[PDB]
Symmetry: D2
Subunit: 390 residues, 4 copies
């Protein structure tokens, strides 16, 4: 059976300790679940299961995916669960929801991801007791999200490894980053993010605040201020806070059903999932994950790289993003036409579904037929998905 | 395509802060991954993906499922990810791994679960700063594992709700718990756990320690000491520490492949996955999850309840376990013939695959044809899987 | 032997998480120690001992009094130690330094107090291990500084007991606070705090900042705030002292020693006293302590020309004034802790500086300083001009 | 006026996380306060002030000295306060209480020290907020008690500096420690600690426990077992866990009054405080503190070193104790005749009064006329007091 994406929605991507500084992840997820239901004309009582990727759920309670579905109005008869493949979680959950319908075990799936890096707590194992001496309170965002478990350094250090191998200069990475800011600022000014974004109401005591714009997009990002920044990981390196994605909060999801099911409801799907793939790479060069993952997804779809009309390649770092574009060789003018994670933000568990939303709504906006979304994953992995319009 | 379980293995279930008090979950997972590979004659270089359920991964680093695969020797080209459906995670990962082969996106999967509740840390959100006054260090095991997010009380309170609706006396729950201990002690004395258990070597500085026996199994559990215990949740209730499953550590997994693949390798599979199902219920009575989940799994398999030769129903609490048996009405003599989680232990993220091991190895020793494994899930959910012998 | 205060100095009182938000207490203390030494023309090598009161030293390292003396330049030959009598520590340390010279065990003492409530950490006992369940990270500032150990409620609740027993209305307590703000705001405009205050340089990365003015003084305090302790009480954030940082000290020596060095002392310690009261009604401590100090000095209440009574709460300050009956026009003529601030370990020496420098500015002969202490205690000291 | 010690008492010195593992310091102090009142026949209503040294009071509430006095029965009219001169606090509080009566501001003083190093908490400044990254939970016992504030290393490192200056071999320091253990073990067997020790009732839930014996006293400390221990501070040093004092809990105090007051009450004082002194030294060699302090104290008393009949020199480290004995040149057979802090323990805030108790009761037991007690203080200080029997 062919699985189509009947509808999709995402929240604005908030800055670290910014708009969503005190908003739990499942509250963002519930808003996205309700949005994809309204946009498709599907009631909450029809959803069979909710699959939400999430990397940092510590302290949010039992199964935040279940919390997001219940708050969105999904009945207790349905099920919900979370999964963690780091940065590719938001997109892998869509593939997993697609398989639930392919194997005949479900009919309607809400799949996506949600992440609140601001709400990540500090933790320490204290059951055995600290008999004597100091101990460390560990930042779960750094430890469980952004630090390689095999070599011990940050994900920006792996980007330094890619930067050294593909011989990408500091100027080339800054030029890529500046281009990402300008494309995102132009798209936001033209309102090209309005369709995918569902407004989120930050319920406050002093007054409610409606967040409907990605607050990481900077206006007037100059190349001179980008080249004045010091390297953020290697003191004699090339990756800085400017040419790297930041820490962000947000949620995104899609409504999944069979093509025949959408046809029975008179729904015009955003696209048809034709293939997907996930491949592992060396954890040292985790940013190269999209390279074998995209080729495997295109091979499963029977497509050549030139067949793609639009591409969404997540920009974890400027060094890894340039390497993926150079290795695969696709036309850069069709890759991230509205900017990328360097300017929009990188909410780990939701970025996979975030770029899926951006990919789906731009394919609809310009009539693209074949699209591809891909991300790199910490620990040395990549995930890719091919979408075709109906 | 038909998916069979080529092999399975589990660690001994360790007591809270006991043998595995300082052992990370992925170290337990790595031992199980290597075991199912040896027991099936499959090399680590052949594994496509590792899917491990885990509820409490805080503080263990990026994607502990990837850490278990790397330590077990699975190459970097493969992928790995974790997922969280609370107590049903260990069994749901097996269903998810089966779907990876059903949809043709993988050939060999190592699926299961791992959990180290002893290593669960205390956490607190400290980014905004505690300007004044005391604040709470939250136990992630209680918050993220054992507390309902909608009503705020422990899972033992939900067992009180089931006990009240089904009119289950304290004596009936104690009689069930004592029966669970006696069956487990007899099985352990007869060596019926020897095949499924792979020994785990607790690497210590003052000598290594080999753990190969479930250390929660009590020898000579009397009814008088069970009826003298005070209620552990409601001070005028019926659920106690004796008639309820404890806090435990452990890991379990299974190797999945198509029936044609296993036949090509001369493997005699432990069983064939014929169906699976997951259903949601009211979070107040989350212990009733196995009732609609088992009925849906049997309906998808085309089986009647009487067709089952062996049943493994997880004993989260004596009150919920008695209600599932009374409602479904299957012969209690074929349900948990070697005891259950009340005596063996309940490592949440791994219990789903744990009872699958007990089901698979008991089906083989007594020649059972049709089996079923099922668990209840916090938040009001259940999961069930039907297995048929080859 | 007669003990005189050869010189005195204090830092500006900083607001909670304000100017001294990241300044350790001993760094403020070191500046005060060096100040009282320069103002008297006495070298650091002549100081025998440094006695500094401090209530919240957790996390600052071994003996912060030793750290303050060494950083100020006091040589290793001298000794240093801290003491804790809560809000009376700053003044009790001066009496203790007076006894060191009276008993012939020392010649020159630098005594005072220092407190950094902003730098107070959160703590929890974790050696035995938390096997299961949540535990509390305890605010040491509240627990060890502002919470009664016998009845478990905040110090603002104890002020409600005093307010209820003495029948002090909300308007009467607020009127006292407004009068305290007006006297303090007026004194800072007239520059009457400039002599006693020694500037402190907050060493910063993006540039140094010199703090020389009490930043808690409110401009335009008008006569709406909700009660901060009792849901139906009278003590509010306005009629109560806040949380602050600061340090203050004095230089001690015999009167014959000061004459041999050509020093003109700010005053002479003639007597001192400390008495305890019921912890339920703390804040009445200055009443028996001042009477005992005046009795030891051979003075009547009318003999006092100037009085410094610490204003922990508006309710406790009114009770002390009503019971003792001294002229309110000579009590806290430049404001009090309600407007200036309340650095616990340093408040005792803070009002001593204000008392000494105002007696000198208007030629007062006899003065008295007194404070209330948590747990039901009071401390008082009588000062006479030369 | 002449100030005499009318009575004295101390608790047993408990091991780190041992008998007094969960006993607050003021509870140990209250027992000692009540003891010195009963042993002298003085009512609590006559005590003017209570002066208790304490180094680690974090988390115990407002003024633990006030808490100890109130719980002991001292009325609210009296006053109480604590002081901190590190390891010399217990003895300095006695000198401070002596000055209160000498200056005519008090008549009866209870002075001493109390310390619960087991109850010391871990702390961290969290008001400004930890925006990102790990932070350290600081052990207040190590930071505020055992770490030099000017050079940053432990007090055992300062003992290494003293050992190098006086050229003290590992064998000489171990031989000193062995002699300290043998003297303490013999005294405890002979009951020479019975008079000074007041039993403490550890109020427990499963039953009360009476602690009346120093639990650090080791039986049969040999030089062969002492030479197998590794150095505890310097990897190529000489100070080990065996030849150094440990971490302990305990309390001790003495009742102070004028000599004429004791005569009016028919009280026979344990001794008369004739002089005291405190001098500072280089913090690098803080162990030499007792040398100028004892010489200054003897000079103030008009005594020669040979006039002393009994000496109590606190054994912070075996290296520091040997240097003090060599410099002063007094007969080693009269120094710590019942053992020292190496075997008995070192409760920081109470050690000053602890060794004072041992000196007073041994001077009474053998009829010694002139005695001296001295300790070294972190940060480079020493304190000494001369006692004469009546
Ligand atoms: C790169 C990173 C360390 C930066 O966070 P940071 O250390 O707190 O540094 P900041 O974000 O506060 O920015 C630092 C400075 O650069 C400036 N700056 C940042 N981005 C800029 C830009 N795009 N243009 C111009 N100036 C910029 C900021 O204003 C700031 O100025 P300041 O020094 O006066 O404070 C953090 O965002 C990060 O870890 N990113 C990696 C995320 C990741 O690994 N995701 C997974 C990938 S698979
Ligand atoms: C029930 C629970 C609260 C117990 O907490 P606990 O107090 O730490 O349990 P403990 O065994 O450590 O202490 C219980 C007491 O009863 C006794 N006891 C326990 N089991 C006993 C038995 N089977 N027979 C006789 N006595 C027993 C213990 O020895 C102890 O007495 P003690 O103080 O002398 O040691 C905890 O195990 C729990 O939360 N279980 C929930 C599991 C769960 O929610 N699973 C998921 C559901 S979907
Ligand atoms: C003030 C205190 C009571 C806590 O109150 P808080 O609300 O938690 O913190 P603050 O009151 O300082 O915050 C300032 C607020 O007061 C208001 N406020 C206080 N005094 C005011 C005044 N005199 N005029 C106008 N506004 C005033 C400010 O506008 C501000 O409003 P906000 O609540 O919206 O922020 C705190 O200072 C305290 O605990 N003091 C105890 C004193 C003590 O124990 N001393 C020891 C000796 S016994
Ligand atoms: C020295 C110090 C670090 C101890 O290190 P420690 O390892 O934590 O002490 P421990 O008892 O836990 O370990 C000591 C080991 O040696 C053994 N040991 C100790 N003393 C021994 C002795 N006297 N004879 C034989 N064996 C001995 C212990 O049994 C233990 O064996 P283990 O390996 O099973 O633990 C600590 O006691 C210390 O810091 N002391 C200084 C206190 C201080 O500074 N006071 C201030 C004075 S100014
Ligand atoms: Rb950026
Ligand atoms: Rb049990
Ligand atoms: Rb105020
Ligand atoms: Rb020792």
């Amino acid at each position: 059976p062919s699985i189509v994406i009947a509808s999709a929605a995402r929240t604005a991507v908030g800055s670290f300790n910014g708009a969503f500084a005190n908003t739990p992840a499942h509250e963002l997820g519930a808003t996205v679940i309700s949005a994809v239901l309204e946009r498709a004309g599907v009631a909450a009582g029809e959803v069979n299961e909710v699959i939400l990727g999430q990397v940092l759920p510590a302290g949010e309670g039992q199964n935040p995916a279940r919390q997001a579905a219940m708050k969105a109005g999904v009945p207790q008869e349905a099920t919900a669960w979370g999964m963690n493949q780091l940065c590719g979680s938001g997109l892998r959950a869509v593939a997993l929801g697609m398989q639930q319908i392919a194997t005949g075990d479900a009919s309607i799936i809400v799949a996506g991801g949600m992440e609140s890096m601001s709400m990540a707590p500090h933790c320490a194992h204290l059951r055995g007791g600290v008999k004597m001496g100091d101990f460390k309170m560990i930042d779960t965002m750094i430890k469980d999200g952004l630090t390689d478990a095999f070599y011990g350094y940050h994900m920006g250090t792996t980007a330094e490894n890619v930067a050294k191998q593909w011989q990408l200069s500091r100027d080339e990475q800054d030029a890529f980053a500046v281009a990402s800011y300008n494309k995102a600022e132009a798209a936001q000014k033209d309102g090209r993010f309005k369709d995918e974004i569902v407004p989120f109401i930050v319920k406050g005591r002093k007054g409610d605040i409606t967040v409907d714009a990605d607050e990481e997009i900077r206006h007037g990002a100059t190349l001179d201020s980008m080249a004045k920044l010091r390297p953020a990981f290697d003191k004699e390196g090339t990756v800085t806070a400017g040419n790297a994605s930041g820490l962000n909060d947000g949620a995104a999801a899609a409504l999944l059903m069979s093509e025949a099911e959408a046809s029975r409801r008179g729904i015009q799907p955003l696209g048809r999932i034709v293939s997907w793939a996930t491949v592992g790479v060396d954890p040292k060069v985790m940013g190269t994950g999209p390279i074998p993952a995209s080729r495997k997804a295109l091979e499963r779809a029977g497509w050549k790289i030139g067949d793609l009309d639009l591409v969404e390649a997540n920009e974890a770092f400027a060094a890894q993003a340039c390497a993926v574009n150079k290795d695969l060789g696709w036309d850069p003018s069709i890759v991230n036409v509205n900017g990328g994670a360097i300017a929009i933000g990188h909410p780990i568990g939701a970025s996979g579904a975030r770029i899926l939303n951006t990919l789906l709504f731009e394919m609809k906006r310009r009539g693209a037929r074949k699209g591809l979304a891909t991300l790199c994953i910490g620990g040395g992995m990549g995930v890719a998905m091919c979408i075709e319009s109906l």
